[PDB]
Design an enzyme around this catalytic site. Structure first.
Site, mmCIF file in Angstrom:
data_model
loop_
_atom_site.group_PDB
_atom_site.id
_atom_site.type_symbol
_atom_site.label_atom_id
_atom_site.label_comp_id
_atom_site.label_asym_id
_atom_site.label_seq_id
_atom_site.Cartn_x
_atom_site.Cartn_y
_atom_site.Cartn_z
ATOM 1 N N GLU A 1 4.996 5.591 -14.812
ATOM 2 C CA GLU A 1 3.716 6.285 -14.938
ATOM 3 C C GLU A 1 3.021 6.679 -13.643
ATOM 4 O OE1 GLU A 1 1.358 2.181 -16.180
ATOM 5 O OE2 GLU A 1 2.226 3.484 -17.770
ATOM 6 N N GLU B 1 -3.377 -0.746 -5.477
ATOM 7 C CA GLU B 1 -4.236 -0.892 -6.656
ATOM 8 C C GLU B 1 -4.110 -2.296 -7.262
ATOM 9 O OE1 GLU B 1 -2.923 0.606 -10.910
ATOM 10 O OE2 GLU B 1 -4.152 2.149 -9.935
ATOM 11 N N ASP C 1 12.130 20.772 9.853
ATOM 12 C CA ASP C 1 11.898 20.748 11.303
ATOM 13 C C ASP C 1 13.250 21.162 12.004
ATOM 14 O OD1 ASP C 1 10.707 20.450 13.761
ATOM 15 O OD2 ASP C 1 10.243 18.296 13.576
ATOM 16 N N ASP D 1 -8.786 4.693 -3.140
ATOM 17 C CA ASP D 1 -9.496 4.062 -4.254
ATOM 18 C C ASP D 1 -9.275 2.533 -4.326
ATOM 19 O OD1 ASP D 1 -6.758 4.580 -5.164
ATOM 20 O OD2 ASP D 1 -7.515 4.621 -7.206
ATOM 21 N N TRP E 1 -7.650 11.756 -1.640
ATOM 22 C CA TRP E 1 -6.475 11.197 -2.295
ATOM 23 C C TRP E 1 -5.645 10.246 -1.397
ATOM 24 C CZ3 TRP E 1 -6.298 11.855 -7.381
ATOM 25 C CH2 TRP E 1 -5.155 11.451 -8.057
ATOM 26 N N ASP F 1 -5.979 2.168 -24.989
ATOM 27 C CA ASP F 1 -5.666 1.615 -23.679
ATOM 28 C C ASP F 1 -6.614 0.487 -23.387
ATOM 29 O OD1 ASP F 1 -5.691 1.213 -20.751
ATOM 30 O OD2 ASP F 1 -4.431 2.999 -20.625
HETATM 31 O O1 LIG Z 1 2.383 16.288 15.805
HETATM 32 C C1 LIG Z 1 2.993 15.089 16.312
HETATM 33 C C2 LIG Z 1 4.476 15.207 15.999
HETATM 34 O O2 LIG Z 1 4.622 15.442 14.591
HETATM 35 C C3 LIG Z 1 5.988 15.551 14.164
HETATM 36 O O3 LIG Z 1 5.948 16.046 12.839
HETATM 37 C C4 LIG Z 1 5.404 15.132 11.889
HETATM 38 C C5 LIG Z 1 4.082 15.701 11.343
HETATM 39 O O4 LIG Z 1 3.074 15.607 12.342
HETATM 40 C C6 LIG Z 1 3.714 14.871 10.135
HETATM 41 O O5 LIG Z 1 2.379 15.053 9.687
HETATM 42 C C7 LIG Z 1 4.818 15.132 9.112
HETATM 43 O O6 LIG Z 1 4.456 14.889 7.750
HETATM 44 O O7 LIG Z 1 5.862 14.269 9.617
HETATM 45 C C8 LIG Z 1 6.449 14.849 10.804
HETATM 46 C C9 LIG Z 1 7.543 13.942 11.323
HETATM 47 O O8 LIG Z 1 8.670 14.079 10.437
HETATM 48 C C10 LIG Z 1 6.785 16.573 14.965
HETATM 49 O O9 LIG Z 1 8.163 16.640 14.617
HETATM 50 C C11 LIG Z 1 6.705 16.234 16.429
HETATM 51 O O10 LIG Z 1 7.523 17.165 17.149
HETATM 52 C C12 LIG Z 1 5.240 16.283 16.820
HETATM 53 O O11 LIG Z 1 5.151 15.977 18.212
HETATM 54 O O1 LIG Z 2 -2.376 7.361 -12.006
HETATM 55 C C1 LIG Z 2 -3.587 6.851 -12.576
HETATM 56 C C2 LIG Z 2 -3.205 5.510 -13.186
HETATM 57 O O2 LIG Z 2 -2.295 5.685 -14.315
HETATM 58 C C3 LIG Z 2 -1.939 4.487 -14.968
HETATM 59 O O3 LIG Z 2 -1.057 4.790 -16.037
HETATM 60 C C4 LIG Z 2 -1.603 5.447 -17.135
HETATM 61 C C5 LIG Z 2 -0.893 6.799 -17.273
HETATM 62 O O4 LIG Z 2 -1.339 7.687 -16.207
HETATM 63 C C6 LIG Z 2 -1.305 7.373 -18.608
HETATM 64 O O5 LIG Z 2 -0.716 8.670 -18.695
HETATM 65 C C7 LIG Z 2 -0.873 6.321 -19.635
HETATM 66 O O6 LIG Z 2 -1.080 6.889 -20.870
HETATM 67 O O7 LIG Z 2 -1.731 5.177 -19.534
HETATM 68 C C8 LIG Z 2 -1.408 4.492 -18.343
HETATM 69 C C9 LIG Z 2 -2.206 3.238 -18.230
HETATM 70 O O8 LIG Z 2 -3.594 3.497 -18.264
HETATM 71 C C10 LIG Z 2 -1.276 3.520 -14.060
HETATM 72 O O9 LIG Z 2 -1.123 2.319 -14.795
HETATM 73 C C11 LIG Z 2 -2.191 3.285 -12.872
HETATM 74 O O10 LIG Z 2 -1.402 2.532 -11.992
HETATM 75 C C12 LIG Z 2 -2.583 4.586 -12.178
HETATM 76 O O11 LIG Z 2 -3.547 4.287 -11.209
#
Ligand SMILES: OC[C@H]1O[C@@H](O[C@H]2[C@H](O)[C@@H](O)[C@H](O)O[C@@H]2CO)[C@H](O)[C@@H](O)[C@@H]1O
Ligand SMILES: OC[C@H]1O[C@@H](O[C@H]2[C@H](O)[C@@H](O)[C@H](O)O[C@@H]2CO)[C@H](O)[C@@H](O)[C@@H]1O
Ligand SMILES: [Ca+2]
Length: 627
Positions: free
Chosen positions: A39, A50, A207, A221, A294, A488
């Site tokens: 889920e 959580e 990359d 959260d 988030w 629930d």
């Molecule tokens: O910007 C610093 C450094 O980042 C490297 O890429 C990262 C990116 O910043 C991050 O947010 C992404 O989700 O992950 C990648 C690493 O896989 C980047 O490759 C470097 O060259 C850069 O110096």
């Molecule tokens: O992602 C929010 C929350 O979901 C929880 O599971 C739910 C699921 O999303 C819903 O579709 C199902 O019907 O009910 C379950 C339980 O309420 C999960 O347990 C949490 O970890 C999560 O934070």
């Protein structure tokens, strides 16, 4: 203890009976007793930040009710030891606050990944890093990573060893249509030992070359919940003359709060309202939304050649926590050590409460949230988009499979924190917000003649709020709809909790809403009459979505091949279960497989740890407030 406090002690004892199997051998709570579940986590003996938050909350209440703070201290001890990455897990070197990360887009479907780094997109300044390094004398980020493979079921182990328990893993990476069913579980510590030649990195980011690296992802959260819990623990312990016992635990919470400010910033520190990926980056707090977004995430090359930090441009009301915000802002025991910590939280407290009010539908339910990054690429908003400090309204922030605000449980979880806040402060806006949401709740909860009950399970939404200008308009064109109902029990308990805090509050500050209390009490009593069982409480639930175990294709690019730790091969066309073959050895696998081959909807009675916690805590909350 009265009747309600006795119910708490009964469920507490069920949770802590080691034969019931809520915790692993290290004392780490599982997502659920039952392993066959999918889920948010995709297997029940994973765990989440959580779960750890709820564990802390459960033991806080135990302290309140018994005078014994050892359970609370142990809960925190385990949290810190296992769920906060240690120095060796997050060896961060060469961070540049003027260049926090390199931008990559978010994309509408998983088949658009890996997402290209776009090296010319400007990224803004991180105004927290220097302050936090100066304050704590470390580059260590004090926050929970969100997802752990508690008993190393996947095989990644700890820092690439393939064998240790409490293995940091991640799943979601590939945008709003990547459901829980469509992920590729991968280690947080990436040493290229699994997956493909570049481990898993090139499923997610495109990359020119790839380096070994670590990365973690906070779920704000949960961290905020743990702070909320700790606030009550220290209030309750001060009442007993036991403050100093938990003194050091209150400081962990205050420190967690300090780092949790990363959740208040745009993903790439871009200014609010920029609506252009090519705009100049923020220069400080012009990139703060001051909401609990988030996530925040951070990473570093195993080298030390670089590191990075991101916030998140998308905020959901379901994440917000005015009770934690107020505590960090205003309570001298919980004051963060940084110069700006508490002031930043005071800004966030007020921004949050405005956010909830802006999102309040015509009927009273709370709509989803908002984004500073339309489509996850700083697009221009559609004409006519309603906005909040320059963020665009989204009915379903972040995820669409299913919509993040189709789950009614956010209503309860989040409004419970507002109800606690109103109980403590008497804030008029929080009270007016609550009164209308409580009015809605009373109109939608089903109390059946036969003593059964049902609460909304799924919601749908239409329209938008009015653009925010500091006061609530009624949002007459924003509508909730209840699509279906369910039982629930975690959510039912959470809603009763919210209603109890609200009722207690109205008694202190206005006209006692006794109906709210009575509805809460009915839910808790009907549940207790109907759903107790050997491991706590459960109610049957149908999971037709479990066809996706067998049928859901996991996108893998043509030509990419790799392996999971158990040898399962990852390639184009694989299904959910193909990369998780160990599921076939689950005790309930035969049951599910037969149900599926036979055309039938499987049905379960789960003991989710968080739900059992919510149940216990709501019953206790009746005693604390009204007994
Ligand atoms: O910007 C610093 C450094 O980042 C490297 O890429 C990262 C990116 O910043 C991050 O947010 C992404 O989700 O992950 C990648 C690493 O896989 C980047 O490759 C470097 O060259 C850069 O110096
Ligand atoms: O992602 C929010 C929350 O979901 C929880 O599971 C739910 C699921 O999303 C819903 O579709 C199902 O019907 O009910 C379950 C339980 O309420 C999960 O347990 C949490 O970890 C999560 O934070
Ligand atoms: Ca999908």
């Amino acid at each position: 203890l009265g009747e309600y406090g006795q119910r708490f002690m009964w469920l507490w004892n069920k949770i802590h009976d080691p034969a019931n199997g809520y915790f692993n051998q290290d004392g780490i709570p599982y997502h659920s007793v039952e392993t066959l579940i999918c889920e948010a986590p995709d297997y029940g003996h994973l765990t989440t930040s959580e779960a750890f938050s709820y564990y802390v909350w459960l033991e806080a209440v135990y302290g309140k009710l018994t005078g014994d703070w050892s359970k609370f201290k142990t809960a925190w001890d385990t949290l810190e030891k296992y769920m906060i990455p240690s120095a060796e897990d997050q060896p961060m070197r060469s961070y540049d606050p003027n260049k926090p990360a390199t931008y990559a887009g978010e994309w509408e479907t998983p088949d658009k990944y890996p997402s290209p780094l776009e090296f010319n997109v400007p990224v803004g300044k991180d105004p927290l890093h220097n302050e936090l390094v100066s304050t704590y004398g470390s580059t260590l980020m004090y926050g929970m990573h969100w997802l752990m493979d508690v008993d190393n079921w996947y095989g990644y182990g700890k820092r690439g060893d393939g064998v240790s328990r409490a293995s940091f893993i991640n799943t979601f990476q590939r945008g709003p249509e990547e459901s829980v069913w469509e992920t590729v579980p991968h280690p947080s510590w990436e040493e290229f030992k699994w997956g493909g030649p570049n481990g898993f990195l090139d499923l997610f980011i495109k990359d020119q070359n790839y380096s070994k690296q670590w990365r973690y992802t906070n779920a704000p959260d949960a961290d905020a919940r743990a702070i909320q819990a700790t606030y009550w623990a220290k209030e309750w312990a001060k009442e007993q003359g036991k403050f100093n016992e938990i003194s050091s635990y209150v400081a962990k919470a205050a420190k967690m709060g300090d780092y949790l400010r990363y959740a208040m910033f745009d993903k790439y520190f871009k200014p609010l309202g920029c609506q252009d990926k090519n705009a100049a980056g923020g220069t400080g707090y012009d990139s703060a939304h001051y909401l609990l977004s988030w996530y925040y995430a951070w990473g570093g090359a195993l080298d030390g050649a670089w590191s990075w930090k991101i916030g998140c441009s998308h905020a959901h009301f379901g994440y917000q926590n005015p009770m934690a915000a107020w505590a960090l802002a205003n309570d001298s025991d919980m004051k963060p050590k940084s110069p700006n910590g508490a002031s930043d939280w005071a800004k966030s407290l007020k921004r949050q409460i405005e956010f909830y009010r802006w999102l309040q539908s015509a009927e009273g339910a709370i709509a989803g949230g908002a984004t500073n990054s339309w489509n996850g690429r700083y697009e221009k908003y559609p004409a006519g988009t309603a906005t909040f400090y320059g963020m665009a309204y989204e009915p379903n922030p972040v995820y669409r499979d299913p919509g993040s605000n189709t789950w009614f449980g956010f209503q309860a979880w989040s409004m419970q924190r507002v109800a606690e806040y109103y109980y403590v402060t008497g804030d008029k806006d929080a009270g007016a917000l609550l009164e209308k949401w409580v009015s809605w709740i009373k109109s939608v909860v089903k109390l059946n003649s036969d003593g059964t009950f049902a609460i909304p399970s799924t919601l749908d939404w239409s329209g938008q709020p009015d653009t925010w200008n500091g006061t609530y308009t009624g949002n007459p064109n924003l509508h909730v709809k209840v699509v279906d109902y369910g039982t629930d029990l975690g959510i039912t308990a959470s809603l009763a909790n919210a209603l109890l805090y609200y009722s207690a509050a109205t008694k202190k500050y206005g006209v006692f809403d006794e109906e709210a209390k009575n509805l809460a009490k009915e839910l808790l009593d009907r549940m207790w009459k109907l759903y107790r069982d050997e491991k706590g409480l459960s109610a049957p639930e149908k999971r037709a979505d479990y066809k996706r175990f067998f049928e859901q294709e996991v996108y893998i690019p043509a030509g990419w091949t790799g392996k999971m730790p158990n040898g399962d091969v990852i390639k184009s066309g694989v299904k959910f279960i193909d990369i998780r073959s160990k599921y076939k050895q689950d005790p309930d696998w035969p049951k599910l497989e037969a149900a599926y081959k036979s055309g039938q909807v499987p049905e379960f009675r789960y003991h989710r740890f968080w739900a059992q916690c919510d149940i216990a805590i709501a019953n206790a909350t009746y005693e604390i407030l009204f007994g």
